[PDB]
Amino acid sequence: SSFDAHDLDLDKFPEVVRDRLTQFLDAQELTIADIGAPVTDAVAHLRSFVLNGGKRIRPLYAWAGFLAAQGHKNSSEKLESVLDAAASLEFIQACALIHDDIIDSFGVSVSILAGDMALVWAEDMLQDSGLSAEALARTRDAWRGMRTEVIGGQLLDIYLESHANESVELADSVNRFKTAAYTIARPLHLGASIAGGSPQLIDALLHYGHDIGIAFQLRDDLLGVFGDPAITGKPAGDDIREGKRTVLLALALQRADKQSPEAATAIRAGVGKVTSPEDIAVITEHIRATGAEEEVEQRISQLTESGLAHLDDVDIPDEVRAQLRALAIRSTE
Amino acid sequence: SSFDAHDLDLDKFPEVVRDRLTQFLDAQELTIADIGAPVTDAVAHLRSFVLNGGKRIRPLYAWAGFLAAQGHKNSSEKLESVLDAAASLEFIQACALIHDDIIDSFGVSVSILAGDMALVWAEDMLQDSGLSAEALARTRDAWRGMRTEVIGGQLLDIYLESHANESVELADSVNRFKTAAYTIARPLHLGASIAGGSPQLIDALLHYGHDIGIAFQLRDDLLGVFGDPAITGKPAGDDIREGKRTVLLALALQRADKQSPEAATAIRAGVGKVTSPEDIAVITEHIRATGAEEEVEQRISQLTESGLAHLDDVDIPDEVRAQLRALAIRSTE
Numbered sequence: 154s155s156f157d158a159h160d161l162d163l164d165k166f167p168e169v170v171r172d173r174l175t176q177f178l179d180a181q182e183l184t185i186a187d188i189g190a191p192v193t194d195a196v197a198h199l200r201s202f203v204l205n206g207g208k209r210i211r212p213l214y215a216w217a218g219f220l221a222a223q224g225h226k227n228s229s230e231k232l233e234s235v236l237d238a239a240a241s242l243e244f245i246q247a248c249a250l251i252h253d254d255i256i257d258s259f260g261v262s263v264s265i266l267a268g269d270m271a272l273v274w275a276e277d278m279l280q281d282s283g284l285s286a287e288a289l290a291r292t293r294d295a296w297r298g299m300r301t302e303v304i305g306g307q308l309l310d311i312y313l314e315s316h317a318n319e320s321v322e323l324a325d326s327v328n329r330f331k332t333a334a335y336t337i338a339r340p341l342h343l344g345a346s347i348a349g350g351s352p353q354l355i356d357a358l359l360h361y362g363h364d365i366g367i368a369f370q371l372r373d374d375l376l377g378v379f380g381d382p383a384i385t386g387k388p389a390g391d392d393i394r395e396g397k398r399t400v401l402l403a404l405a406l407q408r409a410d411k412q413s414p415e416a417a418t419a420i421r422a423g424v425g426k427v428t429s430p431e432d433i434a435v436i437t438e439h440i441r442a443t444g445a446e447e448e449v450e451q452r453i454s455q456l457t458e459s460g461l462a463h464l465d466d467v468d469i470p471d472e473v474r475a476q477l478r479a480l481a482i483r484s485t486e
Numbered sequence: 487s488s489f490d491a492h493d494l495d496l497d498k499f500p501e502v503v504r505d506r507l508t509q510f511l512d513a514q515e516l517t518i519a520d521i522g523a524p525v526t527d528a529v530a531h532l533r534s535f536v537l538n539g540g541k542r543i544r545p546l547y548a549w550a551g552f553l554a555a556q557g558h559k560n561s562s563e564k565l566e567s568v569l570d571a572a573a574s575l576e577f578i579q580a581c582a583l584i585h586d587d588i589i590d591s592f593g594v595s596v597s598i599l600a601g602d603m604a605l606v607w608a609e610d611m612l613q614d615s616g617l618s619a620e621a622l623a624r625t626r627d628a629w630r631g632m633r634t635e636v637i638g639g640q641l642l643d644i645y646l647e648s649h650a651n652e653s654v655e656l657a658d659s660v661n662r663f664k665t666a667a668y669t670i671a672r673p674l675h676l677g678a679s680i681a682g683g684s685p686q687l688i689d690a691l692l693h694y695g696h697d698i699g700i701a702f703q704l705r706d707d708l709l710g711v712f713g714d715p716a717i718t719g720k721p722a723g724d725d726i727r728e729g730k731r732t733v734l735l736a737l738a739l740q741r742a743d744k745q746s747p748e749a750a751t752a753i754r755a756g757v758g759k760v761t762s763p764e765d766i767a768v769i770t771e772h773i774r775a776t777g778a779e780e781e782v783e784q785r786i787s788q789l790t791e792s793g794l795a796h797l798d799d800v801d802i803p804d805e806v807r808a809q810l811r812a813l814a815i816r817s818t819e
Contacts, residue, residue, distance in 0.1 A: 181634070184634055184638075185634070185638060188635070188638035188639065188641075188642060188659065188663050189638075189642045189645075189656065189659050191641065191642055191645035192638045192641045192642050192645075195641045248602070252598050252599070252602065255594075255598060256592070256594075256595045256598060256599075259589070259644075259648065261588075261589075262589045262644045262648070263641070263644060265585050265588060265589060265598065266585070266589075266637055266640050266641050266644065267641075268602075269581070269585065269601075269602075269605065269637050270634070270637045270638075270641075272602065272605055272606070273605070273633040273634065273637065274634075276609050276633075277630050277633075277634075280613075280626065280630075281626065281630065286619035286620075286622075286623070287619075289619075289622075290619070293613065293614065297610050297613075297614065300606040300609075300610075301514070301517055301518070301603070301606065301607075301610075302521070304599055304602050304603045304606065305517075305518060305521035305522075305525045305603075306521065307599050308521075308524065308525045308528045308596070308599050308600075308603075309521060309522045309524055309525050311592075311595045311596060311599065312522075312524035312525075315592065315595070323522065326521065326522050330521050
């Protein structure tokens with residue numbers, strides 16, 4: 154744990170997060186073993202899942218929020234406690250991915266309960282972090298907001314998929330709550346609250362997180378259709394096969410209805426129903442021909458520009474600002 | 487909220503719990519509405535589920551633990567905060583029932599996320615209760631223990647059902663963690679910790695909760711086979727139809743293997759696989775003929791006696807002791 158406590162290192166931070174998560178998971182072993190070997194076996198699977206992949210973007214943003222607020226001075230909280238608070242976000246994400254996997258498709262029984270274990274341990278990892286009572290109290294707004302917002306965002310998303318709903322507005326809401334609040338804005342808010350950040354600083358970070366978080370989901374939607382598996386780690390056009398209700402898809406249908414009824418029909422008939430690479434590609438080319446991809450790219454550009462501008466609105470240490478800009482640019486390109 | 491703050495009223499307490507839960511649910515409406523109408527619709531369903539049934543046994547035990555420790559004196563915590571801490575247990579239980587319903591059998595998607603919302607709101611209702619920092623800190627052991635124990639207990643139970651496992655010992659473990667820790671011992675512990683209860687008092691309550699909690703599950707197992715639907719609110723022998731891996735069933739198979747291979751075979755072939763009342767009844771009579779029901783009844787008697795005896799081991803206000811005895815007797819008969 155000898156890293157620079159005043160500077161933001163994007164590339165090495167995930168290593169620190171994995172260390173904190175390792176320590177926490179190790180500490181649960183005896184209690185789990187007192188219950189029984191099959192529970193040890195289930196938690197081993199959760200442990201592998203939590204430790205063995207993830208970009209750690211959410212703890213990274215919490216850490217950046219702490220550094221942005223903590224300025225050139227010393228917060229009185231223990232460094233280890235701050236890092237554990239940041240890292241606890243990985244357990245929320247583990248639950249989200251495990252539960253979303255069941256939703257987008259017993260191992261189902263073990264998965265539901267493993268996800269629930271991850272969610273209770275996210276809370277424990279925060280409450281047992283060693284943050285002071287005062288710091289814990291300051292976490293409430295961001296932590297209460299984040300967890301209601303992400304689950305509320307997922308509920309809205311489930312509805313769109315189940316009702317094959319084509320509202321651009323509703324897809325926007327999903328992006329605001331399921332992604333932007335959850336992934337960027339509230340982690341920044343959490344880290345800044347731990348550091349005792351001012352309302353002005355928190356406001357600037359929350360605006361950045363709102364704009365960059367939406368742009369990040371839009372980029373992710375474009376990659377889920379047009380990106381190479383080498384970049385996405387899923388088969389090409391997975392989002393077509395899965396029937397995701399994206400802003401890209403809503404805009405493609407809006408436009409195709411005006412340009413080619415045959416094309417609009419083929420997209421409607423195909424999304425979330427086709428399987429073969431060939432069928433996926435044909436729907437994808439119909440989407441591209443609508444012009445919707447460029448409209449999404451324009452939104453990403455606009456949001457990236459406005460999110461970055463929000464950082465100039467308050468004083469943030471130079472190095473932290475630089476890294477928040479770099480993180481945004483990597484996230485959205 | 488004008489009830490007696492020093493006495494335990496078993497019959498009226500659930501009304502108070504419903505009031506606290508109502509207030510909490512009302513307070514989430516605006517935030518949920520800012521996300522979207524379908525999220526309001528999902529939470530409406532969760533609201534009905536939480537408000538419109540439940541015995542409230544867990545908040546009742548938390549309250550009894552508080553009263554047992556608080557003695558003839560005044561805790562400095564606000565009454566409303568204590569009651570909200572007690573009531574937050576209903577959200578844990580809501581998640582447990584919603585998730586267990588999916589496990590024992592999209593509406594599946596909405597159910598998973600509704601359960602997750604209940605679990606995050608259990609935590610919020612506790613952390614936002616207005617308990618002092620000191621009281622919150624005291625809650626950690628009981629609250630950390632309870633949530634890991636109940637999920638760990640459920641994981642072990644899933645394993646027994648999936649592996650059609652017949653260990654009496656493993657069924658015992660499930661009862662200790664999924665029921666006794668979760669339903670009685672840890673709620674008592676939580677309430678006592680809020681009141682600043684001594685280690686001696688907490689020890690007596692935890693022993694009571696361990697013994698009475700196991701006896702309660704054993705009684706529930708007998709009712710799930712031999713009880714009238716008027717008492718259980720499920721069809722007769724539901725536990726046979728569902729294939730529950732009970733201590734009753736493990737002991738019935740242990741014995742039948744020695745008494746009637748034909749009978750042991752019929753029980754093995756039938757549990758969790760038969761459907762008709764007639765088929766259920768035939769398996770049930772095979773179970774009764776083994777003598778296992780009397781062996782379970784003896785265990786209930788023994789545990790009820792030892793759990794009650796634990797209350798005489800420390801000083802508890804007379805009225806609280808009386809009601810803890812009555813609660814145990816109702817729970818286990």
